[PDB]
């Protein structure tokens, strides 16, 4: 692709975050024959059912609602859209490492704080280690913005798929482990075990048994013995810089661009990348990003950006 707006988690065969291809169909007949009135301009447009309307190009179809979906962009054929993931076209620095990276994950806190994907992984892994995931009755376990902002828990839990199979599996075990821990139990310390154990409260010797047979001291977690036993600070300025809608320096890509055909300067007023030239005698339809006539490659790779 020239430019990708969308990322999906591709199960088989990529098992990773990949650019996604946006598709649209008629919600009635399910064919690729829905001509939209207006192209999508944001994630709500392609996630909320029936939000967008058009006309099904069948003589047999009265359908007027669009249904959008994604495919992995890395190969021919339905994966889940990772809507918090954005291409970092304005070079916003990451909240925790302060480097410019792309793509980035953008929290739904009021500040729309921005974290690179490597830092997001490290955020996740640190919180898993330290048992600091956050419980929500309506969700299960998740994490909020790294800065601690309110009302910012991640709700589309498929985002934790981006951690990859092993850490995602640790995340999937966390709830059951936490049940044991909140009940006063202990997890087996043997790497590759971590069974949740519920020994009697006052017993220092814990044996992993129904597990792996390991007898450990629940106080120091080493092999059982008689006798006595032998990341979270977010910079305030870094956080202010790392906000999606904060004012930014001008990049090589200008925000007012000439019409590819008539050269007259053109302002963009929404997320959709299909531009219609405002000049009465021009009316060229073109991709804001690519400077070319509007086409289905641009639709699929970057119909809108955020
Ligand atoms: Zn794939
Ligand atoms: Zn139809
Ligand atoms: Zn980072
Ligand atoms: Zn935040
Ligand atoms: Zn064990
Ligand atoms: Zn000990
Ligand atoms: Zn024009
Ligand atoms: Zn384009």
Numbering used by the authors: 141 to 217, 222 to 354, 359 to 378, 390 to 465
Paper passage:
The covalent attachment of ubiquitin to specific protein substrates is achieved through the action of E3 ubiquitin ligases. Parkin has been proposed to function as a RBR ligase such that it encompasses both of the major classes of E3 ligase in one protein. Our structural, biochemical and cellular data indicate that Parkin functions as a RING/HECT hybrid. Parkin likely binds E2 through a conserved structural motif on a canonical RING domain, and also functions through a HECT-like active site cysteine whose activity can be regulated through interaction between the R0 and R2 domains.
Our 1.58 Å structure reveals that Parkin forms a relatively compact overall structure with multiple unpredicted domain interfaces. We solved two structures of Parkin to determine if there were any notable structural differences between the sequence of Parkin originally reported (containing P223) and the updated sequence (S223). Overall the two structures were extremely similar; however, the loop containing S223 was visible in Parkin-R0RBR but not in the P223 structure. Aspects discussed in this paper were indistinguishable for Parkin with S or P at position 223; The structure discussion focuses on the S223 protein. Each RING domain binds two Zn ions and resolves discrepancies in the literature regarding Zn coordination. The R0RBR structure reveals that the molecule is folded in half with the N- and C-termini forming an extensive interface that comprise two compact domain groups separated by two linkers. One domain group is comprised of an association between R1 and IBR, the other domain group is formed by a close association of R0 and R2. In our structure, H433 is involved in water-mediated hydrogen bonding with W462 and is not available to deprotonate C431, representing an inactive state of the enzyme through misalignment of the catalytic residues.
